[PDB]
Design a protein around this ligand. Structure first.
Ligand SMILES: [Cl-]
Ligand SMILES: [Cl-]
Ligand SMILES: [Cl-]
Ligand SMILES: [Cl-]
Lengths: 174, 174, 174, 174
C-alpha cells in the first residue's frame, strides 16, 4: 500500500487526481486547436505552433502532478478524457478567447486546490502549487491577454489582413 | 563645509539642484509611460521598452548632475518629486507627443542653465552641459520627431493597424 | 480594462501601489545618503557606494512590484514622492541607524501586505513576496545589524580613526 | 615667421607663455614634494608616489600648451623657473594643504586665460582649455579635498598612527 504517506489527506489525493484529468483535457483541447490551424484552409503556422506548445505544457503539468501524487504516497486514478468542446475553432481571435477561458478554469482549479491544502494544513502541497503552477499560470494568462489586445486592434475593417499580420509579426514561425 | 569650491556661484548651485528635480520628474514620467504600455489592455512591448529606457537615461542624467555638484563643492538638496501629469497616456501618438513636450522643457532648462553659466563666467559648467547634455537632447528630440512623423503617416483610416505596425517594425522588441 | 484579472482584490491592488511609493521613497533616501558621503567634506567612498547600491536595489524592487501589478491585471497609480527626511546624514553610524529604521519600515509593510494577501486567499501574492522580498529584507537587515555592531565597537575615544577604518576595511571601495 | 597664425592675439600668446611657466613651476614644486617624502626620516612611499605623479602631470600640461602655441603660430618664450616655496614640507597634511593652494592658483590662471580668450573671440583657445584642462583640474581638486578630509579625521590624538594609516590604506604604494 504505502509506508510513506504523512499529512496527505484523502481529499487532497482525490483533488489532485481530478486536476490531472483537467490538465490532460486541456492538453487535448490544445492538440485540437493546433491541428485546426495546420489545416490547408486555415494555414496559420504561428497559431498552430502556439497551441501545439501549450498542449505539451499542459501534458507536462499533469505529469508533474502524478509524480507528486506518488511522492506523497497517494494513488493515481485515471478517468475517461472528454473530447474538446469544439471540432473547429473559428478565427485566431475566437481561439485565443477560448484559450483564456480554459486557462482561467485551470487557474481557479489551482486556487481551489491551494485553499484545500491550506485548510488541511498541508504546506508541502501549497508550496508545490506556488512553486510550479500559480506563477506559470499568471504569466500565461498575461501573455494571452496581451495577444487578445493585439488581435483586437488588428481587426479594423480588414480582418484577413490583420489575422495574417498578427501571425507573421507576433507569433513564432519558421 | 567645502575647501574646494572655486568660481561656483550660489545661483548655479541652486539651478543645478532644480535641474536634478526636473530630470528625476522626467524619469518618473517615463516609468509611468513604460508601465502603461505593459498593461494587458494596451500591450505594445516596443513602446513600453522605449519609455522604460528613457526612464533610465533621465535617472542617469540626474546622477551625473549630482556628481558634478559635489565635484564643484556645491551641496545637493532634494525636493519632493511630483507625480506624472497623467495616469493613462492614450495612444502611442499621444504618448510620443507628451514625450517631445517633456524633452523640449528639459532642453529649455539646459539652455537656461548654460546661459546662467555664461553670464557667471563659469566655463566648467558650460563645458559640462555641452559635453554631456545638449547634443544628447538634440539627438533624442530628432529621434522623437522622426517617430511622430512615422506614427502620423500610419494613422490613415486604420489606426489600430498603424499602431501595431509601428510598434512591430520601428520599435525594438523581443 | 482587463480580461486577465482573477483572484486579485482591490485592497491588494491599492496596497501594492502604496508599497511602490514606499520603495521609490526608500530609493530616493538612499540616493541622498550616497551623495552625502561623496561630499568633499565627508569623503567616505565605501559608505557612498553602500548607499548608492541600495538606491538601485530599492528602485528594482519597485519595478518588480509594478511588473507584478500588470501581470495580475491591476493598475499602477503613482503618487508624489516625498523628499528624504534629512538633507545631511551625520556620521556613518547615524546613517546606518537611519538605514535600519528605514528597512524595518519596509519589512513591516511587506509583512502587512503578506497578511492582507493571506486574508484575501491570494496565494500568488503571498508567494511573490516570499520569493522576491521577505528573505532579501531579512538578509539586508542582518547585514546592517552586523555593520552597526562593528561601527559601534570602533568608536572608542577615537571616532574619526574608527570611521576611517570601518570604511577602509569593511566596506567595498576602489 | 608664421604663415599660419589666424585669430590668435598677442595677449593670448603671452598669457600661454606665462601659463607654461606656472605649470613648469608646479611640476618643480611636486618634484620637491615627492623627494621630501622619500627621505629616510620621512619615509611615506604612497605620499612620495602621489606627488611624483603630479610632477609628471604638470610637465605634460606645459608640453600640451607648448604644442598648442606652435599649432596656432605663436612663439614659445621660456623664462627662469623659480624654485619651490619650501625646502621641507612638514606633514602629509601640510603638504596636501600646500598642494590644494597650488592647484587653486593654477585653476584661477586657467579661468583667467579662458576669460581672455572669450573676450578676444578665440573659440579654439576656449575649447582647448575646456577639453584638456578645466575638468582635469576640477577632478584633481576634488580628489585633494577628499584626501584632506580623510587626513584631518585621522589626526585624533595619535598623529603618527593616522599619518601611517592614510599612507597605507588610501594612497597607492608597492
Ligand atoms: Cl464531452
Ligand atoms: Cl503634481
Ligand atoms: Cl516630506
Ligand atoms: Cl623664488
Amino acid at each position: 500500500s504505502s509506508q510513506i504517506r504523512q499529512n496527505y489527506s484523502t481529499e487532497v489525493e482525490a483533488a489532485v487526481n481530478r486536476l490531472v484529468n483537467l490538465y490532460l483535457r486541456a492538453s487535448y483541447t490544445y492538440l485540437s486547436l493546433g491541428f485546426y490551424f495546420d489545416r490547408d484552409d486555415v494555414a496559420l503556422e504561428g497559431v498552430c505552433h502556439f497551441f501545439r506548445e501549450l498542449a505539451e505544457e499542459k501534458r507536462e503539468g499533469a505529469e508533474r502532478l502524478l509524480k507528486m501524487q506518488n511522492q506523497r504516497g497517494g494513488r493515481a486514478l485515471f478517468q475517461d478524457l472528454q473530447k474538446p468542446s469544439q471540432d473547429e475553432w473559428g478565427t485566431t481571435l475566437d481561439a485565443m478567447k477560448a484559450a483564456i477561458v480554459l486557462e482561467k478554469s485551470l487557474n481557479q482549479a489551482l486556487l481551489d486546490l491551494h485553499a484545500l491544502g491550506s485548510a488541511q494544513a498541508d504546506p508541502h502541497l501549497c508550496d508545490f502549487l506556488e512553486s510550479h503552477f500559480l506563477d506559470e499560470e499568471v504569466k500565461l494568462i498575461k501573455k494571452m491577454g496581451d495577444h487578445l489586445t493585439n488581435i483586437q486592434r488588428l481587426v479594423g475593417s480588414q480582418a484577413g489582413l490583420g489575422e495574417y499580420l498578427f501571425e507573421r509579426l507576433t507569433l513564432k514561425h519558421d
